[PDB]
Structure formats: structure tokens, C-alpha cells
Amino acid sequence: RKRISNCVADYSVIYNFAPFFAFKCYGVSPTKLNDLCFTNVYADSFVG
Amino acid sequence: NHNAQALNTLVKQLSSKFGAISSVLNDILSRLDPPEAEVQIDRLITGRL
């Protein structure tokens, strides 16, 4: 688990990797992400 | 008293989601794609009518 805050992200270059399995981004559509603010962002990683 | 109560209830009814992400048009417009914005706006319209 990693928490990121108090920073500005490009939100457009993170696509330079390979296409992923699925984009089930509930709520905000993952194309209108550069214009709105949030409070805090988390990132959890694991390996069905 | 009745004429004030009816108008107060009508005004207060504007803060109900009726089933949606949010009860404010601007946030829905600036947060989501048009295909889902249509559904949200339709839900709000059906709520208010």
C-alpha cells in the first residue's frame, strides 16, 4: 500500500505501459481525470 | 402557513439524488462521460417532474 498526496500528476503518460486486463474505473471516467481535484490517492498492489 | 409550507417543500426537494452519483449537475457534467451523463440527467429530470 502506498499513499500519494500534496503533489501534481500528469495523469496522461501513465499509459505508456502495455494495455491492461480491464479498466473498471467506477465514478470518474478515466478520460476526464486532468480537470478535477481529489483529497487523497491510494495505490494497492498484489498478484484469481 | 400552507402557502409557505408548500413552497418550502418544493425548494427543499432540489437536494435529493433520486438515485445518481451526485445531486449537482455541474459535478456530473465535469466528472463523467456523456453516455453516463445522459442517464444521470434523465434520473434527475424524472425526479423533479
Least Cα separation, residue A32 to chain B (angstroms): 6
Count of pairs with CB atoms under 8 A, one residue in A, one in B: 17
User: Which chain B residues are closer than 8 Å to A32 by Cβ?
Assistant: 30-33
The β-bridge relationship of strands A2-4 and A41-43 is antiparallel
Q: What is the resolution of this structure in A?
A: 3.2
Contact A25, B28 (CB under 8 A): no
Burial class of residue A17 in the structure, from the number of CB atoms within 10 Å of its CB (0-12 exposed, 13-18 middle, 19+ buried)? exposed
DSSP 8-state class, residue B9: H
B41 contact A CB<8A: no
**Shortest CA distance to A25 belongs to which of B32, B37, B30?**
B32
Chain A residue with CA closest to B31: the answer is A28
CA quadruple A28, A30, A31, A33: dihedral sign? positive
CA A1 – CA A3 distance, rounded (Å): 7
CA quadruple A27, B15, B30, A36: dihedral sign? negative
Instruction: Identify how the structure was determined.
Output: cryo-EM
